[PDB]
């Protein structure tokens, strides 16, 4: 739904990296390069962003 | 130009993408319904005979044309308004469209004057509408428009909303009609039996079956043994078997030469001639058509008073009740003689061993009844009822001499309620005739997972009853390839009976054979009525929809022409099956609905007709107008049904099987688009499913249906009875190509988990799992449980009514130890209020004939927060409240978790991050599974996914786990992993979290997609200690929700007998269930009347009151003896 | 309250000449039979103009009182 | 409900969602009945087959096999940790097997403390060679495959399912027959707690590395399959050329199927053995098979060498289509691939036809499981 | 072995003997018609029934794409190299694994067994 | 077995014994053929001596042949056929109660016809219905006979149906039954418990 | 609206209602074991 605040495995903060991650992908970065640019070195944290699905964007389409 | 193998993998998935961009995944549901509304409903109305009234003036009624409006809802004030599907769900309305018909009323008054009036658009009822079908409001709405209507764009539709319940019609599997099938019964008195289930075109009055059987040789006799085996026919409406030669005589063929000319097409064959000789002798007595007709009539449904009635009745049965699909007219005797002779000819070939017996498990011999044919069957009965009551109503008025109002003659309840009831209950047919009504056709759509929702819309139901047991129908027949998923099937009584469509499988909707028949006549096909029987031997029989239309002397040219027309879509539509049985000299053409087909790439001269230009055009599928249907029009891909697959030489892949190699097959007709399409929706999410033991793939297909996630994007607006939503669903790091079309990325049902396969502390043994407590503290596999409670206040009766209010302990009679303080003044709890077990969320009071309490109590285990409180008017116009209670479910010990490989397991313990084992990088596993789960199960795909998941996470690319992909190997994955500074086999040095010491063995650890299953321990934990008892047996109630007791069954009782624990056995079966006391007369063992208040015990019957004994027995034993006494038995309990 | 005899299955269920020997008989009271027909008429009218079931239930209750009160016994039930 | 791992076998229970029922006796008389008749320790040995009904399973069984290997040595600190989990320990630390250059206790030494009383048992390890009993080292086993417990001490031998499982003559069986249910109860708990905590040091996993084989092994498996293909082709040619003489008592069709099945069964056996030989002592697949904890040699061969012939109703895949198994084969194709012989391993992956034929074979087991539950249930009730 | 129908009413003709002439005759039941018998064999029952399968084969099978084709068995009549082979698959044989070859050359439906 | 071979009465009144034939719930005596009424069988059985009854394997004090003819029908107590309350204060009567209504109506109708002196064929049709309702009150699975429905297509559950089967009175409520003081939940491993211990949640305890 | 003697819910036969009493034995729903009525058939019928 929304980017988890912490990595589930180690507790690193990843909830401030989704927008930056999306922007890097917009800048023609490969997913691996974008994750490296954000400092996510452990594959547990790379898992968080590489596999995230932002459904909250779909939910915002429905009127409150 | 030509697709090279280096580009085939991309090319084939561009083709598959265009197919799903066009067809979707519930196309069989929507297409079937569209045909029923567009064609079947109009045909059923057109086919109805005009209603003629005569009782003098003569009135005629003809129903001309059908109109259907948008699904409309009428407010209590009478104002119509379009009914949105979401409103129907919330207000428990039925999503139905008004149905109107044009009726012309012509009256003849015997004065040579005719008055004709047309009642345009006469309301005749409401048809439930399948969602996202052509007649649904959501049809043709852009994804943006759907969101404005609070509808999920990913929602596929294909279901009905009946009383707010989403209902899906399961495809009902049945044997194909109009086809001759010869089967051998080992035990029966018949050596062979050739049946044909003949049905009228457009599925008129239900199928009529005719059996042609050959008697077994078991009977011993000088006359019976000498002659051989005789053939008898089991016609409908006839009690007893009729000899076959008599039926031919009744048709108008008397001379033996004439009859044999219709059965044996080559008299030069002596073996077949000797087979029919015993049948000729049996009917030697009957030598006239009228005598034969009388003989059949003698066995008729009703006895014939006179011979003339018998002959007329026999002609009636043969004319229409026998082989109706061949013909139903009075000039069809010759056509039926040829077909009946073909049935006898087919039976002879089976007996002679020249033709193999037909297979019931073959899906060429099967049809799937979808919503359309299902709905059309109901509508024919309801429309006949509508006209039956229109005739009855008009008869009363015309009899009295007054004209009748046409509108008042029509009862709109007949179609509206008849359609609604069948979909509402699933009992298929009539409520009055529920005894013969097929059950389970309609089911509430499963919304546990988006994959579960998709699977339920593609489910297939076998004809065989679930209660009945038979391995053969439950087996995975060869013919299910590409049509039915070989892995998705339930475990238990339904193994092999409930099936799911393969991913690209399509079910033919049906079309008229008229264009094909006309072309055949234009082509050099000799009609069956014009040829001589001698010409049939050399020529090939032409069957269209099971009806023998004629013969052809050049089958090869005709098949090439037919194939060319279908590929060009000139006269033959794509879903038409053309089967040439070269050995049997038959060409079978099929056009009816229910045929399962799949798209296949056409191969000519060992070359795919699909070239690079087609792929390039598809690549620009948008802004180019080129789609999947252009591939079918271009003639490079065509649909193939199961029957036609037998005649197809098919290449698994072009890159290898078409290429020059060791000569195996140089004549390939078709090619798979991709072999992964043999899987269904649920099996298509298994990564590396070709590396697992097959039962594991079946288990995952079941588990995936129970995985939490986001079942639909608009789940917030919905108020479902149960709904599970995962906090943080992830798309799998290791995916399959097919997953792109299941929308699994858009609605994932799991999380990628760092999984270590290790024996850590013994808390993951025997399919148990160790979870990371710290990961769970961070939202790992956190889920929401939504439960909705609906309550309706209805006033019905002279002074009895129900209202929403807070029931005061003094004012209201009924009451419970729960808490009524949360309820607001209007009797409804408010959103945002914490509610626990034994809390009242709806305050409902029913006036006492002061007032009883019917208040809704929250589930005892449930402890959530009121999320939404919706109040509205239900379909009945009564005030209606739905309350959604939200409970957050943090993964506990005992919660089920599965990988995508059948490796399910409850959480055995949760360790904090410091207690968990860690790598040198500080990574701890989120989940630890026991190594002992892998060896016996052989879920190697689980290990590959973990290895590939590690590469995917490090590389930053979603891994591809499409099953039959040579581009992916374990060695290739291992080599990639080495490049990221990890052991190439996925092992890592882990340190004990308790001591910090390196573990001697290196642990296989990596990302694996797990899924939280619906089964949570807190929903299953149940304790009973002297609860309530049921009225009939006075024993503990049944069910966890009723605080029932656990059953101490016969097996548990047998076990305690072996233990010798007589007293504990007495506790369970007497003291802890239903301890009871009765007073028994000593003279007679009957229970005596006991009045403890007056201390007077009497036995009415013995006239004694001094010798009565108290007997301690279970209440169920008392009920048994009393029930036995109701049957005049006298169970006399004697204490001496 | 009553039970309806089901359809025959074997030959023992059918009389010497076809017709079933165990046939349903109408024990319905005349007052109940007329009242049952009126409710059927009430629902037929309501469906014509799409009236909600709550209005039909109110109508059925109204008819029962009038039918029992018997001041309108001279008038047709449909009226 | 939380259960010891040993009682899972008598209950036929697992922890993949199984629910078990609790019944609380409500009086002393019924409470005493359960205590004196139905308690788990009194149920250790079943009268059905005069052998224990529960044993050492899963982790403890796999780890105890590793623990009792000849070359397992424990440091002073490690030993003292294990003795903390020995409820029957007398509190006396035994003299280490090795005193110099460093004090080291063997795994057998620590297990000897777990063994109750002074029972005496003779067993053989699963990997005990048959000719060792006839060799010059009968009483000094080179492989440590001879299990001798004498005077309550494990003097030699690797413990496995054969000496700790639910078999007659098992070391657990002797404990019950000699020491009684109460001491045997402590025996099972002490084995689990002590070796579970040692497994925290030694560890045990299973991954891709255990499913791989040497390139030499793969060539041997490929050659064996390739030879098997030709052998079946040769038999097919003989049958096609009417050169196949039916075996007495069998039809020509039965003779051909017997020859083809014999060839493919032997190839599966030869490929399976070839895979097993390549496995190292560290292989975790072999570790769980030699201990008897889970899996068999067939599972290893299927994962590594070849899945093998898929059968429906005891026969090769039938011609569900007209004279062929699938539309991808020519008619009358009696070769191994057409009739459901899977020449790939699970690690390699199945081809689409193999995957479908394998699914056909798997469906038979699922049908049997559903059938077996009800077919046998009726028999049980009638017997009772 | 042959089957005949009377020329009068086209019904099955059954065998019959005449004592006066002691010659086999075929007489129709419902017709009284009689005919001189020339076969002299009422019927033959073939227990083994080793019917030559080549007669049962249809030359059109060469057009089947799913049948295997071999170039190592040239047609004996026309010499065409390509031929299609298959098994009988006919019940009551009690044994069938031999191959039946059909020439693939059009207009030459030659069939043989090796 | 011995009496079947005989065909004449020997004793007194040497006469031909009819071949009794049953067609559903009716007995036919063929010698010609008459409908053997239950009252006729009652009269025959009433005259069987106690000693003769003993020979037939029937204890006269516990089972007389005539008692097998239903003269007075036992009406089960309310507890045997209790009405269940569901969806408001509207009792739903038991299948036995529904069947008893048919029996009470037909015998009441039959009694009036006899008093009113109705036609013999009218009474015979009434007796046929009474036989059916009485028979299906005890066994509603009569072979080759119509089932008694619940006015909605659901067959009535008679007394015989209640007692037989896995879920019947005997097997479902006597040989096995639901019990108090029992708990059920998922099981998870615990290597730190003894083999004879079970870890139990506090909520269950 | 109340139980009637000689009917199907004869109060002398049971107390199937929670708030009730049996006329025959003056017991409540739990105390009363139920009592048998009978129907006198106009003509005898066979016992199936
Ligand atoms: Mg389980
Ligand atoms: Zn991390
Ligand atoms: Zn008494
Ligand atoms: Zn003639
Ligand atoms: Zn040739
Ligand atoms: Zn009482």
UniProtKB/Swiss-Prot annotation, chain C:
Residues the record lists as binding DNA: 73, 75
Phosphoserine found at: 13
Q: Where expressed (tissue)?
A: Expressed in the inner cell mass forming the embryoblast. Not detected in cells from the outer thin layer trophoblast (at protein level).
Subcellular locations according to the entry: Nucleus; Chromosome
Report the superkingdom from the record: Eukaryota
What does its PTM field state? Acetylated.
Record-stated family? Belongs to the TFIIB family.
State its role. General transcription factor that plays a role in transcription initiation by RNA polymerase II (Pol II). Involved in the pre-initiation complex (PIC) formation and Pol II recruitment at promoter DNA. Together with the TATA box-bound TBP forms the core initiation complex and provides a bridge between TBP and the Pol II-TFIIF complex. Released from the PIC early following the onset of transcription during the initiation and elongation transition and reassociates with TBP during the next transcription cycle. Associates with chromatin to core promoter-specific regions.
Q: What is known of its domains?
A: The TFIIB-type zinc-binding domain is necessary for the interaction and recruitment of RNA polymerase II to the core promoter, the formation of a fully competent pre-initiation complex (PIC) assembly and basal transcription initiation. The C-terminus is necessary and sufficient for interaction with the TATA box-bound TBP complex and for the formation of PIC.
The UniProt subunit note reads as follows: Found in a ternary complex with TATA box-bound TBP. Part of a TFIID-containing RNA polymerase II pre-initiation complex (PIC) that is composed of TBP and at least GTF2A1, GTF2A2, GTF2E1, GTF2E2, GTF2F1, GTF2H2, GTF2H3, GTF2H4, GTF2H5, GTF2B, TCEA1, ERCC2, ERCC3, TAF1, TAF2, TAF3, TAF4, TAF5, TAF6, TAF7, TAF8, TAF9, TAF10, TAF11, TAF12 and TAF13. Associates with TFIID-TFIIA (DA complex) to form TFIID-TFIIA-TFIIB (DAB complex), which is then recognized by RNA polymerase II (Pol II). Found in a RNA polymerase II initiation complex. (Microbial infection) Interacts with HIV-1 Vpr.
Quote the protein name from its UniProt record. Answer: Transcription initiation factor IIB
Full-protein residues shown: 80 to 158 of 316
Swiss-Prot record, chain E:
- Zinc fingers (C4-type) span which residues? 6-31
Listed A to Z, the keywords are: Acetylation, DNA-directed RNA polymerase, Metal-binding, Nucleus, Transcription, Zinc, Zinc-finger
Q: Where are the zinc fingers (TFIIS-type)?
A: 71-113
Provide the binding site for Zn(2+) 2: 75, 78, 103, 108
MF terms (GO), sorted A to Z: DNA-directed RNA polymerase activity; nucleic acid binding; zinc ion binding
Which Gene Ontology BP annotations are present? Answer: maintenance of transcriptional fidelity during transcription elongation by RNA polymerase II; transcription by RNA polymerase II; transcription initiation at RNA polymerase II promoter; transcription-coupled nucleotide-excision repair
Instruction: Fetch the InterPro entries from UniProt.
Output: DNA-dir_RNA_pol-M_15_CS (IPR019761), Rpa12/Rpb9/Rpc10/TFS (IPR012164), Zn_ribbon_RPB9 (IPR001529), Zn_ribbon_RPB9_C (IPR034012), Znf_TFIIS (IPR001222)
Q: Which Gene3D superfamilies match?
A: 2.20.25.10
Q: Where in the cell is it found?
A: Nucleus, Nucleolus
Q: Does the keyword Transmembrane apply?
A: no
Q: Which residues bind Zn(2+) 1?
A: 6, 9, 28, 31
One matching Pfam family, short form?
A: Zn_ribbon_TFIIS
Q: Which GO terms describe its cellular component?
A: nucleolus; nucleus; RNA polymerase II, core complex
- Which protein family is it in? Belongs to the archaeal RpoM/eukaryotic RPA12/RPB9/RPC11 RNA polymerase family.
Q: What does this protein do?
A: DNA-dependent RNA polymerase catalyzes the transcription of DNA into RNA using the four ribonucleoside triphosphates as substrates. Component of RNA polymerase II which synthesizes mRNA precursors and many functional non-coding RNAs. Pol II is the central component of the basal RNA polymerase II transcription machinery. It is composed of mobile elements that move relative to each other. RPB9 is part of the upper jaw surrounding the central large cleft and thought to grab the incoming DNA template.
Instruction: Return the protein name.
Output: DNA-directed RNA polymerase II subunit RPB9
């Amino acid at each position: 739904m929304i980017i988890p605040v912490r990595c589930f495995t180690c507790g690193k903060i990843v909830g401030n990296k989704w927008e930056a991650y999306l922007g890097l992908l917009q800048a023609e970065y490969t997913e691996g390069d974008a994750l490296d640019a954000l400092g996510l070195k452990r594959y547990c944290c790379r898992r968080m962003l590489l596999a995230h699905v932002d459904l909250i964007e779909k939910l915002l389409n429905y009127a409150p | 130009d030509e697709i090279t193998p280096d580009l085939w993998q991309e090319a084939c998935w561009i083709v598959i993408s265009s197919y799903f961009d066009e067809k979707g995944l519930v196309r069989q549901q929507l297409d079937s319904f569209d045909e029923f509304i567009q064609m079947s409903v109009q045909r059923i109305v057109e086919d109805a005979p005009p209603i003629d009234l005569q009782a003098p003036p003569r009135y005629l009624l003809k129903f001309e044309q059908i109109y259907l409006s948008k699904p409309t809802h009428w407010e209590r004030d009478g104002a119509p308004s379009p009914m949105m599907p979401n409103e129907a769900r919330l207000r428990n309305l039925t999503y139905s469209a008004p149905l109107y018909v044009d009726i012309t009323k012509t009256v003849i008054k015997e004065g040579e004057e005719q008055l004709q009036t047309q009642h345009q658009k006469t309301f005749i009822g409401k048809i439930p509408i399948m969602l996202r079908s052509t007649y649904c409001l959501l049809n043709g709405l852009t994804d943006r428009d759907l969101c404005e209507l609070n509808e999920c764009p990913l929602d596929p539709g294909g279901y009905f909303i009946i009383n707010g319940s989403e209902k899906v019609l399961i495809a009902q599997e049945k044997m194909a009609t109009n086809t001759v099938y010869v089967f051998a019964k080992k035990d029966s008195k018949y050596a062979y039996t050739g049946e044909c289930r003949s049905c009228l075109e457009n599925s008129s009055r239900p199928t009529s079956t005719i059996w042609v059987s050959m008697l077994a040789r078991g009977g011993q006799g000088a006359k019976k043994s000498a002659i051989g085996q005789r053939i008898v026919a089991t016609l409908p409406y006839i009690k007893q078997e009729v000899p076959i030669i008599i039926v031919f005589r009744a048709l108008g063929f008397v001379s033996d030469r004439d009859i044999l000319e219709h059965i044996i097409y080559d008299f030069e064959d002596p073996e077949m001639m000797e087979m029919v000789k015993p049948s000729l002798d049996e009917a030697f007595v009957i030598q006239e058509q009228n005598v034969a007709l009388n003989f059949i009539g003698s066995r008729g449904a009703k006895p014939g008073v006179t011979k003339e009635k018998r002959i007329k009745y026999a002609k009636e049965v043969l004319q229409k009740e026998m082989l109706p699909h061949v013909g139903v007219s009075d000039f069809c005797e010759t056509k039926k003689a040829y077909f009946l002779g073909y049935m006898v000819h087919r039976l002879l070939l089976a007996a002679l061993g020249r033709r193999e017996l037909d297979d019931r498990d073959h899906y060429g011999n099967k049809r799937l009844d979808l919503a359309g044919p299902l709905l059309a069957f109901l509508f024919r009965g309801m429309f006949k009822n509508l006209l039956k009551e229109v005739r009855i109503y008009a008869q009363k008025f015309i009899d009295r001499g007054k004209d009748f109002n046409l509108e008042l003659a029509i009862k709109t309840r007949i179609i509206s309620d008849g359609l609604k009831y069948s979909l509402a209950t699933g009992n298929w047919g009539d409520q009055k005739k529920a005894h013969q009504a097929r059950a389970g056709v309609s089911q509430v759509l499963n919304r546990l997972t988006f994959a579960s929702t998709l699977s339920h819309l593609r489910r297939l139901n076998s004809p065989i009853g679930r209660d009945g047991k038979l391995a053969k129908p439950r087996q995975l027949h060869n013919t299910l390839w590409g049509m039915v998923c070989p892995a998705e099937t339930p475990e238990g009584h339904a193994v092999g009976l409930v099936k799911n469509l393969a991913l690209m499988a399509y079910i033919s909707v049906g079309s008229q054979p008229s264009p094909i028949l006309e072309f055949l006549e234009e082509w050099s096909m000799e009609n069956l009525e014009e040829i001589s029987p001698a010409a049939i031997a050399d020529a090939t029989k032409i069957f269209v929809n099971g009806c023998w239309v004629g013969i052809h002397k050049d089958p090869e040219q005709l098949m090439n022409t037919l194939r060319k027309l279908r590929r060009q879509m000139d006269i033959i539509v794509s879903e038409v099956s053309m089967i040439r049985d070269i050995r049997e000299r038959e060409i079978r053409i099929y056009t009816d609905a229910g045929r399962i087909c799949r798209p296949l790439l056409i191969v000519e001269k060992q070359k795919l007709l699909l070239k690079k230009r087609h792929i390039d055009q598809l690549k620009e599928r948008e802004y180019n107008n080129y789609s999947w249907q252009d591939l079918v029009a271009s003639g490079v891909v065509e649909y193939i049904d199961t029957l036609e697959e037998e005649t197809v030489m098919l290449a698994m892949t072009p890159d290898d099987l078409q290429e020059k190699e060791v000569a195996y097959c140089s004549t390939y007709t078709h090619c798979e688009i991709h072999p992964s399409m043999i899987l269904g929706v649920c099996a298509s999410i298994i990564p590396f499913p070709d590396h697992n033991q097959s039962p594991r793939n079946t288990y995952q297909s079941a588990m995936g249906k129970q995985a939490m996630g986001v079942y639909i994007t608009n789940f917030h607006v919905r108020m479902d009875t149960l709904a599970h939503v995962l906090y943080y669903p992830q798309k799998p790091l290791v995916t399959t190509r097919s997953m792109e079309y299941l929308r699994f990325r858009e609605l994932p049902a799991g999380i990628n988990s760092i999984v270590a396969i290790a024996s850590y502390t013994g808390y993951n043994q025997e399919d148990s799992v160790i979870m990371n407590r710290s990961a769970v503290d961070r939202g790992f596999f956190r889920s929401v449980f939504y439960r909705s409670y609906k309550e309706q206040e209805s006033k019905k009766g002279f002074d009895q009514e129900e209202v929403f209010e807070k029931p005061t302990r003094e004012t209201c009679q009924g009451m419970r130890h729960a808490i009524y303080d949360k309820l607001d003044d209007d009797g409804l709890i408010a959103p945002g209020v914490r509610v626990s077990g034994d809390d009242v969320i709806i305050g409902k009071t029913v006036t006492l004939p002061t007032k009883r309490d019917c208040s809704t109590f929250l589930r005892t285990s449930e402890t959530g927060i009121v999320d939404q409180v919706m109040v509205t008017l239900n379909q009945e116009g009564y005030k209606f409240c739905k309350i959604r209670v939200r409970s957050v479910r943090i993964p506990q010990i005992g919660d089920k978790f599965a990988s995508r490989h059948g490796q399910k397991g409850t959480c055995g313990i949760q360790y904090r991050q410091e207690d968990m084992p860690f790598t040198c990088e500080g990574i701890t596993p989120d989940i630890i599974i026991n190594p002992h789960a892998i060896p016996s199960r052989m879920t190697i795909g689980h290990l590959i996914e973990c290895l590939q998941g590690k590469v995917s996470a490090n590389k930053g690319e979603i891994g591809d786990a499409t099953p039959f992909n040579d581009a992916v190997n374990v060695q290739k994955i291992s080599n990639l992993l080495s490049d990221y500074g990890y052991h190439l086999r996925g092992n890592e040095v882990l340190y004990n979290g308790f001591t910090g010491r390196k573990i001697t063995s290196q642990i296989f650890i990596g990302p694996t997609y797990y899924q939280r299953l619906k089964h949570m321990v807190d929903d299953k934990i149940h304790s009973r200690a002297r609860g309530p008892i049921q009225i009939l047996n006075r024993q503990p109630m049944e069910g966890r929700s009723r605080d029932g007791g656990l059953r101490f069954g016969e097996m548990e009782r047998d076990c305690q007998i072996a233990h010798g624990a007589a007293q504990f056995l007495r506790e369970r079966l007497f003291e802890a269930s239903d301890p009871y006391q009765v007073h028994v007369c000593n003279l007679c063992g009957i229970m005596a009347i006991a009045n403890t208040r007056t201390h007077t015990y009497e036995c009415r019957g013995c006239r004694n009151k001094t010798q009565i004994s108290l007997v301690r027995m279970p209440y169920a034993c008392k009920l048994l003896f009393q029930e036995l006494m109701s049957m005049s038995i006298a169970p006399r309990m004697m204490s001496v | 309250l009553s039970t309806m005899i089901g359809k025959g299955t074997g030959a023992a269920s059918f009389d010497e000449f076809g017709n079933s020997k165990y046939q349903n008989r109408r024990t319905m009271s005349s007052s109940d039979r007329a009242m049952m027909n009126a409710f059927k008429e009430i629902t037929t009218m309501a469906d014509r103009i799409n009236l909600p079931r709550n209005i039909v239930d109110r109508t059925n209750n109204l008819f029962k009182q009038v039918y029992e009160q018997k001041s309108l016994k001279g008038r047709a039930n449909d009226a | 409900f939380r259960l010891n791992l040993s009682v899972t076998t008598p209950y036929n229970a697992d922890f993949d969602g199984d629910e078990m029922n609790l019944h609380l006796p409500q009086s002393l008389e019924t409470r005493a009945e359960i205590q004196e008749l139905a308690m788990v320790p009194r149920m250790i040995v079943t009268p059905q087959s005069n052998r224990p009904v529960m044993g050492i399973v899963q982790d403890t069984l796999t780890a105890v096999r590793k623990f009792t290997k000849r070359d397992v040595f424990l440091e002073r600190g490690e030993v003292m940790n294990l003795l903390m989990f020995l409820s029957t320990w007398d509190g006396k630390v035994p003299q280490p097997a090795i005193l110099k250059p460093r004090p080291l206790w063997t795994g057998k030494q620590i297990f000897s403390l777990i063994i109750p009383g002074h029972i005496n048992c003779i067993r053989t390890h699963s990997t005990h060679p048959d000719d060792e009993d006839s060799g010059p080292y009968k009483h000094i086993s080179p492989g440590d495959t001879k299990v001798v417990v004498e005077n309550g001490e494990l003097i030699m031998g690797i413990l496995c399912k054969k000496s700790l499982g639910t078999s007659a003559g098992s070391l657990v069986h002797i404990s019950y027959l000699e020491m009684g249910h109460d001491i045997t109860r402590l025996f099972y708990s002490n084995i689990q707690t002590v070796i579970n905590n040692w497994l925290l040091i030694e560890g045990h996993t299973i991954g891709i590395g255990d499913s791989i084989a040497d390139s030499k092994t793969y060539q041997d498996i490929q050659n064996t399959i390739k030879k098997a293909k030709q052998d079946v082709i040769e038999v097919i040619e003989k049958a096609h050329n009417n050169e196949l003489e039916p075996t007495p008592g069998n039809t020509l069709r039965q003779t051909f199927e017997n020859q083809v099945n014999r060839i493919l069964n032997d190839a599966r056996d030869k490929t399976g053995s070839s895979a097993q030989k390549s496995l190292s002592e560290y292989n975790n697949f072999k570790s769980m098979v030699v201990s008897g904890a889970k899996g068999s040699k067939i599972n290893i061969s299927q994962v590594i060498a070849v899945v093998g012939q898929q059968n429906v109703e005891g026969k090769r895949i039938p011609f569900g289509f007209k004279h062929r198994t699938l539309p991808h084969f020519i008619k009358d194709d009696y070769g191994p691939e057409s009739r459901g012989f899977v020449e790939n391993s699970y690690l390699a992956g199945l081809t689409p036809t193999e995957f479908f034929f394998h699914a056909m074979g798997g469906r038979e087991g699922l049908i049997d499981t559903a059938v077996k539950t009800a077919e046998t249930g009726y028999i049980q009730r009638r017997l009772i | 072995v042959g089957i005949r129908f009377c020329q009068e009413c086209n019904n099955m003709l059954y065998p019959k003997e005449d004592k006066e002439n002691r010659i086999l005759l075929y007489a129709c039941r419902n017709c009284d018609y009689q005919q001189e018998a020339d076969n002299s064999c009422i019927y033959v029952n073939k227990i083994t029934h080793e019917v030559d399968e080549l007669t049962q084969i249809i030359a059109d099978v060469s057009q089947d794409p799913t049948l295997p084709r071999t170039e190592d068995h040239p047609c004996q009549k026309c010499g065409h190299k390509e031929a299609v082979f298959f098994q009988s698959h006919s019940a009551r044989a009690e044994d069938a694994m031999r191959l039946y070859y059909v020439c693939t050359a059009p207009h030459c439906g030659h069939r043989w067994t090796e | 077995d011995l009496c079947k071979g005989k065909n004449i009465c020997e004793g007194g009144c040497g006469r031909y014994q009819p071949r009794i034939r049953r067609s559903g719930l009716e007995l036919y005596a063929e010698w010609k053929k008459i409908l053997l009424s239950p009252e006729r069988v009652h009269e025959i059985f009433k005259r069987i001596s106690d000693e003769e009854c003993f020979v037939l394997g029937m204890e006269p004090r516990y089972a007389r042949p005539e008692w097998m003819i239903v003269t007075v029908l036992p009406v089960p107590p309310l507890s045997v056929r209790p009405a269940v309350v569901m969806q408001g204060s509207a009792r739903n009567q038991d299948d036995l109660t529904h069947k008893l209504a048919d029996i009470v109506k037909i015998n009441n109708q039959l009694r009036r016809n006899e008093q009113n002196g109705a036609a013999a064929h009218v009474i015979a049709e009434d007796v046929k219905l009474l036989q059916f309702h009485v028979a299906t009150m005890v066994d509603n699975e009569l072979p080759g006979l119509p089932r008694a429905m619940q006015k909605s297509g659901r067959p009535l559950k008679s007394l015989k149906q209640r007692l037989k089967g896995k879920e019947g009175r005997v097997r479902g409520n006597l040989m096995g039954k639901r019990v108090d003081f029992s708990a059920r939940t998922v099981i998870t491993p615990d290597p730190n418990l003894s083999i004879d211990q079970v870890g139990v949640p506090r909520s269950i305890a | 609206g109340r139980p009637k003697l000689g009917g199907l819910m004869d109060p002398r036969q049971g107390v199937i209602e929670r708030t009730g009493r049996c006329q025959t034995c003056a017991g409540n729903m739990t105390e009363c074991p139920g009592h048998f009525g009978h129907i006198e058939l106009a003509k005898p019928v066979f016992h199936v």
